[model samples]
Target chain A: ATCYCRRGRCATRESLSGVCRISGRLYRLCCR
Target chain B: ATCYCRRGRCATRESLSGVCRISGRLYRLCCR
Candidate 1:
């Protein structure tokens, strides 16, 4: 379970700001 | 597919701004 932060990979990133659900798909990242 | 926007629902909404992947899930929304 990991996120896809544009700044960096979720596996390495440690500053996930928030998470939002997509349109009938999945969740996305809000990195900080 | 349907998203959960804080502003409204993603089903009928016609203004899908963007999409992102979150925590090993699926695609999320960046709506307008």
Candidate 2:
């Protein structure tokens, strides 16, 4: 249970090159 | 760009609930 991507880093599936946004709606923090 | 939990509901912070496995590791899909 370790996932860290507060500003965009972890990736494996979700793409778009680390696009991150909160309640406003965008994200790309997938991990394994 | 939109974030969706493949197996869990989007969360405000990393939590122990709705844990999902990916690439041989454990991670909970986190979204702002």
Candidate 3:
């Protein structure tokens, strides 16, 4: 899974949860 | 998706990855 940020960045996949409310669109989110 | 554990438990959906090598089987894994 990957989270594409509005800041022109993509967050790496974490072992905890998605990059919610991180100033971007969440490409993939299961926990949220 | 769902992950059925061999320990008689199932881990909830996580946006990161599956519960690998925890104590049972990983039924669903996206990041991993």
Give me the candidate number with maximum TM-score: 1
Q: Write the per-residue lDDT of candidate 1 for residues B1-32, one digit (tens) a residue.
A: 33233434344544454444544544434333
Q: What is candidate 1's CA lDDT for residue A7? A: 37
TM-score of each: 0.29, 0.25, 0.16
Candidate maximizing DockQ? 1
Scanning candidate 3 chain B in windows of ten residues, the lowest lDDT window is B2-11
Please list the residue runs of candidate 2 whose C-alpha ends up more than 4 Å from where it truly belongs after superposition.
Answer: A1-5, A11-21, B1-3, B6-32
Whichever of 1 and 3 has more lDDT, that candidate is: 1
Clash totals, every prediction: 7, 0, 0
lDDT (Cα atoms) of all candidates against the true structure: 0.41, 0.41, 0.30
lDDT of candidate 2 over B1-32, digit per residue (tens): 23334344455454343343334444444443
lDDT of 3 at A10: 34
Interface RMSD of each: 8.3, 7.0, 9.9
- Residue B11 CA displacement from its true place in model 2, Å: 16
Writing each residue's lDDT as its tens digit, candidate 2 over A1-32 gives 23333444455554332333444655454443
True contacts kept of 2: 0.03
Give the per-residue lDDT digits (tens) of candidate 1, residues A1-32: 22353434344444454455444443345432
For candidate 2, what is the lDDT?
0.41
Candidate 3 per-residue C-alpha lDDT over A1-32 given as tens digits, one digit per residue, 9 for 90 to 100 = 42221223333433333322211223233342
